Symmetry: D2
Subunit: 455 residues, 4 copies
């Protein structure tokens, strides 16, 4: 039962902004809900809901700028887009492998962590089966309220305006229910200035080979940060730029291992979202901060040991640490950046991150400083008045539905948020952890009435 | 679409002798074939085939005598009874876990090798859904040819006689097609005599606690062998009998690690059976012998290191090896067994296995010496004449169907063998390796005509 | 060159209080310094310094109450008592093994972490070679200042009074230089009352089998804490008390893995003590708190996974968590302890550790709540006035020598502290990490003038 | 006590042919024996033995042609050149590290297997301390018998003739005792012809970059073999030649893992040589063949998995195996080699190794086919008559001393063999396994009388 197209001029049941892992999980869960074989009920639905997905990328891609060669998953394959909701689903990773004639070969690796490339292709293979309801090259620029009865004081739909990435004109689609699943934006430090030589990690594979077109040149590249991205870049820079001198700049004293130990990893359990959301604001803030080592500013141990083993080989050859080709500079901060000099190389000034150190001259600076999740704020400007009086923060309910004033907004209308709700739903929110079950829940939250007609 | 019962007096399409892993895989594959949602065709079948399973155990059990505490799988969970044929199947291990509310918890172990206890329960959970077509407590004692036209010279069915394990009387069931999937029998050395104190590994958990009813007594137990069973027993004996002196007797000089390395583990691939069967008799004999380290006379490395680490702790405490509580005696053979003495302890005499050594006095002797797969020979005595002239060895075709004289046996009739066909189908034959796909193939081999009516 | 005895009535060069790992390291370093083959200089010393060690234990023991069966080292064998100072030293772990005829056997384990039992024996084997200068069964009860010229205002020696653990009388020994290396004291929570059923982890192997003399009884034991001790106890309780119900009580939500990753593990490097001591008080407090995961409130990953795997087996058997034989209770605190009831079992009342829960009834309560290092404070009461005016905290210099008023105390006299100086010397201070080099430094700090005569 | 030079015209006590790991171990053991601090006796020796080492390499090198980047040890660091004989020795790996200021850094890797580069440097650091008794650039071309009394029928010394690798003239040195420790020679298949494009693995790093001077060219390289060398080359070829197509040709069906499991690894124990030598010729031949998996035709598991994981990534990208950039061709033999064609590429013809397949066109062919140890045979031609009548095979005694006719050869004279004696001393013979203890034994075997004068 493939999801059939809805003409743009028609009132949709659902419009999802973005078609990343989060949205794909919702589409996969809708497919399954409407599948009469996974749901006995689904036989008596017949009428397919009017759903549309808008993605600003040309096709499906999963962090293309960070697809570093050899890079692995930070999560078991069992936490794919379907399995935890229903292992029977056609969209499980194992069934993807089987459909590729590769399942037996994978088994022989004996790994729960597939290559980031392979997993992208898995999520690519899922994405293609919804190409009839996904409009690519469409960047959403704002969501606007609407009224079936213009004279009334009740909002019952939303107009969603999207700029065409190629042609540039704005098209508009009307829906009763809206989902924003747009992921993170590159978070840059404020002290750093704008320069084509200062590049965020998210754009590593895509915009750096353009700048340093010669993989043979003896460049000077620097990497800011101490999380998974910084490590992956720093480690790759050795391989991709064999004659270049690399420098790792971090305010912390060392890269710290990500926590995946079985007892800690319980916070990521799909069922724990209920128990997390139940907790008081002070207890959520206490939990995220305590469990930070599972997600943020941390590196997979095997890569920490790998980076270290390389560093040790440099010692075997040269006892003088200052003479190494690849160097780590712990407890440092960037204070001054000279990027107006005639040469190719900027001049980075460094100080101790503890309460003047060296100076570096670099052709490029990879800034692996993480992501912000406040992008939806810009999209929901025109809909802010629909919240209760006083609300400057969007408040998402358990089912991820933003709180709105019930006297201003019809119950058939509403906006959902997906990816940013870490403060309320837990650390598993921004990741792949619960997407399968979250997708299942979302389909029920949004199409509950419709699916109950057959149930 | 549950498999409905067939009255014993009716002509069956299929009778499987035994309801172990192999038969369960065939039932699981039939279920799936007849499932209209996994097979589009299955909708237009309607009429269920007349199938029956006969098991001599009271209920489903998977090597109960060897369910040693802590004992693990020798195979990935992906090689379960359904996944490699279809990951969508309801009978996959992951879906079993989901149906138990446990899938998320398993993930957190980060293991491809579940506990032998858990996997039994998985295969128990599969087995229960076919209780309507399985007759337990029924030991098959012979399969006999039959003729629809008694005066003709053509055999077109088989009468299968089974002794009731409890009541004792012989019942008979008629089928066109027969499957023998009865697994291995305990292989004992010829030099050893009959004694209730000499026990085969297969009966370790079941018949040893009866003999040594006191888990506190300072017993003397011995273990013969150097394979996975001997190691598991020997290692358990330390834990189950804390005050007893254990002795490991092996003709080889050391326990050798099982080979599960990715390139070697290709022989177990479901697709390789085709390529194996294609090979000449000399090349099959060359392959099994070369790849032996994957299956026979080998121990999982983690358990070799564990047994060794225990042995090292004995050295830390006592430098005198002869004074250890748990001892390994390499390159030894049992020559004389004195089991007629007044005392509780037999007297085992040992010689060098290389071209007189010690003497041991033991309350029990666990003989972990592997299994034979010639049990079907006894069952198929009365059907031997149905083979082509001269044939003293049963010759199984690729689809596991025994070769019979086509002028004596109707094409609607035939006998299949499952588990013993290692000489022709490979090392994966006796194990769980290919059961999912083998079950799929078997259902097609047996019910090909019937399923094509809807196809 | 064995260390010869000094009669108690004679003025010593050195008296060390305690003969644990720290003191043994100092004796080992003195041996080596005086060894003419490890030190070319040592040939022209001839006159051995007058040194004495006072230990309150009957013989050498390394945490006997926590020698849990199977328990391993938290540190590489290379960080033994000699190797990092000089791998040539006779007192290295590898040379200990060689002297036991066991070095080749150890190699075959392929482990950097020996059993806690074996390592004790290693440090026992080192300790015996200094039995001529160690007085066992001697608990030091106070160190007192003395004056060669009683009428003068200059202190130039110390009288060290020790109670005899057996006979009870106080003996006194005079030395110019004093070392306090007494380790930690059991840290108990204030909310808990005194009861023979409430036992600190340090006394687990020694005082619990006395209380619960029946290893067969269905007891109820509880374990407070979430660090390495709590885990080791909790895990052992399963094995040592097979029929007892165990309960783990922790204010944190989960046991967290100890950090031994190569980059973090740099703080433990012998050379880093210099760089640590150099840092400001705010930066030391920032470092210890940030690196806490390496030492405090953490469990070795393999044991976290082991405890978890056991817990998972309980789920396989019983889905009802409340019915498990061994249970973990996260985010709980003990509020009320009823220990005056007629029965064998106390009644523990539990609340949520976050801003009433269950009630437990237990025969014993193992309190694994860590250690305090303020024991020397009691010993140095009579010497407090020797510090500069105002000083209520003992201030240890880099060489671990407590700051004293130079106008009140002769330069030939001084007190050293060993083990408690984490606040000033780093996280490696209380552990085995730097003992080899620290011992080398201490011998130079104390016998510098004497050893320079030959140098 | 450094080993002082002996003028070439003087009668030596010992001449060792070759200065590889084996000889260095003997020099290290002599140093230690003569060290008055490791041997109490050594003080009363005074007179240093007249020893000389002749090496054909310009300086110390340990398999320079196979120093593949990233390549590791196949053996624990504890099995270095000194530790197992005496961990106190100055020449241990740990003490080498300490002398480099690197011991603490190594610890943090947590590895028993150092990089092949680092270990070479360790053995380089040992080698330099014997530069006064090693004559480099000297290839021994024959050992010749001599008689103090030319008219007598008793041989009591040996003249050892060596060609100068640079200048070319033959120099001669006279010794009473001779050691041949020259290692293996490249073993080539007979079917392959002479071509600068056909290169043995031993010359990989040294003679291949000369042939394929462009690391950018899209070459075709092939690798024959399935042992550790073939794997290391094949895996490196991907990294060193990023645009080249690699092909692995092996007569076996898969690369098999080296056995390092604790129980099997007992055959390598220094003490086991005694027990091995004691065994009958049939039992030695049975042991080597059974334990082959520890040394020959085997690959370290981590590299098998690594090669496999790369191969799997090729499947993810292209399902067509024939289109992969790096390919493995199992069960193949080279039958015809066309190396007279005008092009750069030879034409290799392949057949099935089981009782015509593809054709390959290659710029180079790396032949990793192992080593022969019959090089000493050529050197000892002129001394063959000194054996007992009939002897065409050199028979080495337990102490590695070749059997000679006692009526023809004085007891003060004799020849020792080191490295080739696997047939008599075990699998540990050709490796680093027992060198420390073997060196100790050799020094005692050769300088027994001399060292007993002081003992
Ligand atoms: C390099 C990298 C690797 C990671 N790997 C893992 C891992 O191993 N496992 C794991 O659990 N977590 C991982 N994550 C975390 C990751 O954020 C989530 O796993 C997952 O990608 C979240 O998906 P999402 O749909 O919420 O956000 P995204 O993946 O960012 O998807 C959002 C999509 O919406 C589109 N979009 C954005 N703005 C607009 C707009 N205005 N209009 C229309 N479309 C828009 C974007 O193009 C994007 O395709 C990784 C993150 C990074 C950066
Ligand atoms: C202790 C142990 C653990 C193992 N674990 C693994 C593992 O980790 N993974 C793996 O791949 N391989 C394993 N195996 C190998 C094992 O043989 C197969 O995996 C699998 O059990 C084969 O199933 P089967 O149905 O062919 O034989 P069986 O499992 O023996 O099933 C045959 C059934 O038929 C019944 N039966 C026998 N005779 C008769 C009769 N005359 N009439 C009626 N019924 C009869 C028996 O009661 C039995 O239930 C293990 C073997 C042992 C002994
Ligand atoms: C169970 C356990 C295991 C550990 N294992 C490790 C490990 O794996 N590696 C590691 O690096 N760290 C470990 N540690 C940390 C440990 O504290 C140090 O490694 C080491 O024991 C410190 O030695 P110390 O001499 O400073 O203190 P201690 O080991 O406590 O030695 C002090 C000695 O002085 C004696 N003493 C005390 N008071 C007096 C007195 N008044 N008069 C006379 N004598 C006295 C005591 O009896 C004791 O023998 C462990 C700690 C515990 C509790
Ligand atoms: C690539 C590679 C890696 C290895 N790594 C390991 C390992 O991880 N651990 C391990 O235990 N085993 C390893 N080995 C096995 C190795 O053979 C031994 O460990 C060790 O090198 C044996 O030393 P040797 O002195 O007996 O022989 P060699 O190392 O070959 O030393 C012989 C020396 O004598 C010189 N020589 C030769 N002929 C003459 C002549 N006619 N005149 C004068 N001088 C001559 C040679 O130049 C050479 O330097 C490895 C082998 C190879 C090929
Ligand atoms: N071309 C291969 C033949 C080489 C032969 N098997 C040998 O080892 O001599």
């Amino acid at each position: 039962p493939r999801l059939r197209s809805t003409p743009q001029d028609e009132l949709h049941d659902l419009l999802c902004v973005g078609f990343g892992p989060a949205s794909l999980a919702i589409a996969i869960a809708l497919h399954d809900a409407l599948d009469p074989r996974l749901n006995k009920s689904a036989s008596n639905i017949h009428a397919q809901p009017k759903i549309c997905f808008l993605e600003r990328q040309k096709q499906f891609a999963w962090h293309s700028g960070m697809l570093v060669p050899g890079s692995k998953m930070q999560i078991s394959f069992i936490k794919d887009l379907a399995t935890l909701r229903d292992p029977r689903s056609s969209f499980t990773f194992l069934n993807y492998l089987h459909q590729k004639g590769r399942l037996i070969h994978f088994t022989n690796l004996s790994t729960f962590l597939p290559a980031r490339l392979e997993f992208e292709d898995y999520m690519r293979w899922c994405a293609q089966q919804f190409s009839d309801v996904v409009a690519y090259g469409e960047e959403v620029v704002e969501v606007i309220p609407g009224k079936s009865d213009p004279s009334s004081s009740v909002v019952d739909f939303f107009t969603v305006r999207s700029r065409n990435v190629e042609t540039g004109e704005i098209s508009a689609r009307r829906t009763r229910k809206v989902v924003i699943a747009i992921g993170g934006t590159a978070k840059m430090p404020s002290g750093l200035p704008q320069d084509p030589r200062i590049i965020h990690s998210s754009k590593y594979c895509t915009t750096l080979p353009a700048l340093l077109k010669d993989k043979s040149k003896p460049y000077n590249i620097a990497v800011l940060g101490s999380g998974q991205s910084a490590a992956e870049i720093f480690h790759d820079l050795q391989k991709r730029y064999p004659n270049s001198r690399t420098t790792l700049i971090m305010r912390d004293s060392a890269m710290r291992p990500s926590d995946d130990s079985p007892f800690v990893n319980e916070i990521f359990n799909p069922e724990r979202v209920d128990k997390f959301y139940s907790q008081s604001a002070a207890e959520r803030q206490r939990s995220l901060l305590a469990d930070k080592a599972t997600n943020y500013s941390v590196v997979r141990l095997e890569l920490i040991e790998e980076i270290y083993n390389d560093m040790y080989l440099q010692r075997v050859k040269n006892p003088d640490e200052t003479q190494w080709q690849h160097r780590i500079l712990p407890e440092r901060k960037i204070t001054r950046v000279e990027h107006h000099g005639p040469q190719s190389r900027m001049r980075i000034h460094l100080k101790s991150s503890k309460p003047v150190k060296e100076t570096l001259e670099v052709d490029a600076l990879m800034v692996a400083t993480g992501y912000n999740r406040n992008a939806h704020e810009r999209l929901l400007s025109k809909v802010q008045h629909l919240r209760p009086t006083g609300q400057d923060q969007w408040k998402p309910h358990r089912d991820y539905r933003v709180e709105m004033d019930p006297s201003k907004v019809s119950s058939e209308a509403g906006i959902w948020l997906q990816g940013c709700n870490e403060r309320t739903h837990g650390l598993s929110d921004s990741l792949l952890s619960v997407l399968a079950v979250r997708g299942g829940e979302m389909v029920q939250s949004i199409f509950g009435e419709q699916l109950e007609r057959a149930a």
